[PDB]
Amino acid sequence: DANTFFGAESVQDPYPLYERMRAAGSVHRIANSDFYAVCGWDAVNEAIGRPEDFSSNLTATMTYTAEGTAKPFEMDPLGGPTHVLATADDPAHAVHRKLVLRHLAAKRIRVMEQFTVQAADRLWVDGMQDGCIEWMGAMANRLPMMVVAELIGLPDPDIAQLVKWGYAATQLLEGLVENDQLVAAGVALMELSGYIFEQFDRAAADPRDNLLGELATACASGELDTLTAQVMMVTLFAAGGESTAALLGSAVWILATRPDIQQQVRANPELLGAFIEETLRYEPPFRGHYRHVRNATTLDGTELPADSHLLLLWGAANRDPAQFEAPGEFRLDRAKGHISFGKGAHFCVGAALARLEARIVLRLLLDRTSVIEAADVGGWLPSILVRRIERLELAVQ
Ligand code: HEM
Numbered sequence: 001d002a003n004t005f006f007g008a009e010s011v012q013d014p015y016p017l018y019e020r021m022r023a024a025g026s027v028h029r030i031a032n033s034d035f036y037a038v039c040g041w042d043a044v045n046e047a048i049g050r051p052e053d054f055s056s057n058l059t060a061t062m063t064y065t066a067e068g069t070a071k072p073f074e075m076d077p078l079g080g081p082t083h084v085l086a087t088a089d090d091p092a093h094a095v096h097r098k099l100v101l102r103h104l105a106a107k108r109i110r111v112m113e114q115f116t117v118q119a120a121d122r123l124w125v126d127g128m129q130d131g132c133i134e135w136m137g138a139m140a141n142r143l144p145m146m147v148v149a150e151l152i153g154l155p156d157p158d159i160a161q162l163v164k165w166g167y168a169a170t171q172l173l174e175g176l177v178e179n180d181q182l183v184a185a186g187v188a189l190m191e192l193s194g195y196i197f198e199q200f201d202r203a204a205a206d207p208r209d210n211l212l213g214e215l216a217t218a219c220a221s222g223e224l225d226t227l228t229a230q231v232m233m234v235t236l237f238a239a240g241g242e243s244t245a246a247l248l249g250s251a252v253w254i255l256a257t258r259p260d261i262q263q264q265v266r267a268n269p270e271l272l273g274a275f276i277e278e279t280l281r282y283e284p285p286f287r288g289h290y291r292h293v294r295n296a297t298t299l300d301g302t303e304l305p306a307d308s309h310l311l312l313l314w315g316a317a318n319r320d321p322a323q324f325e326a327p328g329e330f331r332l333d334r335a336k337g338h339i340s341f342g343k344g345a346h347f348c349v350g351a352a353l354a355r356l357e358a359r360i361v362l363r364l365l366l367d368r369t370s371v372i373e374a375a376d377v378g379g380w381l382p383s384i385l386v387r388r389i390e391r392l393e394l395a396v397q
Pocket of ligand 1: 347
């Protein structure tokens with residue numbers, strides 16, 4: 001594959017790849033695999049609007065052999081009970097989404113704001129020494145994991161552990177990182193799982209006003225199964241922790257490497273919300289999400305066999321030249337949006353929270369500095385699904 005989704009180049013910068021795929025059409029088979037890249041804006045919107053045809057159950061991911069050949073990493077079949085929340089179809093999906101939304105209501109977000117302000121300040125104090133901070137390990141990796149742990153109700157977490165735990169599932173699900181990294185991720189996910197099961201067993205005996213308690217209560221009344229509830233909580237670390245970490249990393253990487261953009265936001269602090277939205281458009285934390293194709297059908301004109309899969313490429317949709325002027329240019333004056341939080345039945349429940357974490361953290365960084373520059377920029381996580389920088393050493397004044 002001239003158009004492979006893995007390899008050093010695609011990991012570093014996948015956007016030219018998406019434009020090549022788009023030449024073949026808005027939907028296009030990946031090599032000779034059973035996966036079809038969805039790069040068109042209208043095609044992604046159509047797909048997400050057809051949950052009956054394109055299930056969210058994660059029945060397979062795309063992986064690559066050592067020989068570089070795409071192949072399916074098969075998981076739980078269509079309709080299975082392992083599919084929860086973001087990967088569940090209705091009716092279970094709507095129950096799951098309702099329960100989690102209770103912990104993301106307006107009042108909940110206000111509490112989170114106070115929590116985030118205090119946590120961000122402590123992280124900055126600990127991490128910024130002699131005009132230097134490694135942004136990923138000190139801030140971007142930690143803060144969003146602490147927020148997910150607080151939403152769930154975990155007591156006074158070991159932050160070092162949380163980061164490991166929170167990044168484990170992506171690595172395991174793709175099987176793209178090296179074997180030693182995969183073994184460590186498996187240990188990490190075992191540890192995370194076991195910790196959640198321990199905390200849930202304790203919540204069931206005395207439910208408190210957090211998602212653990214909400215779930216313990218809903219299980220007691222028969223609304224869902226105990227194991228389903230525990231798995232739901234496990235998945236929130238990748239869903240809400242890793243994704244937000246990625247945004248915090250990319251936003252800063254852009255500030256640090258585009259002085260013109262950084263001066264614009266400094267000079268006109270009212271452009272911070274636009275800058276966050278443009279980062280979401282231009283470097284979405286998720287490269288994509290899968291769907292399972294239930295029956296032979298068509299999407300935006302393109303044929304799809306039964307039991308194939310879609311890869312919904314949010315980043316590629318956000319650069320569709322039918323929808324956006326100057327799609328490849330980072331601009332602070334746009335007034336269409338983006339599809340980086342999805343749309344429709346599974347539209348991100350955490351979007352307000354994510355946007356709040358970005359606003360708090362980025363305003364702290366900008367308010368406390370006069371100039372930020374990149375001293376050393378690491379590589380990106382080897383992934384087909386997630387767009388996360390691994391290391392970003394800043395020099396500040
Ligand atoms: C920048 C940060 C974030 C991005 C880019 C992001 C993106 C997404 C996307 C694209 C979807 C739809 C997936 C699909 O259609 O298959 C989604 C769903 C979801 N997001 Fe996020 N998200 C972020 C932050 C968060 C946070 C902070 C939380 C929770 C604390 C969260 C929880 C979820 C959940 C539970 C769903 C599934 C909703 C449902 O199935 O009804 N997200 N998110």
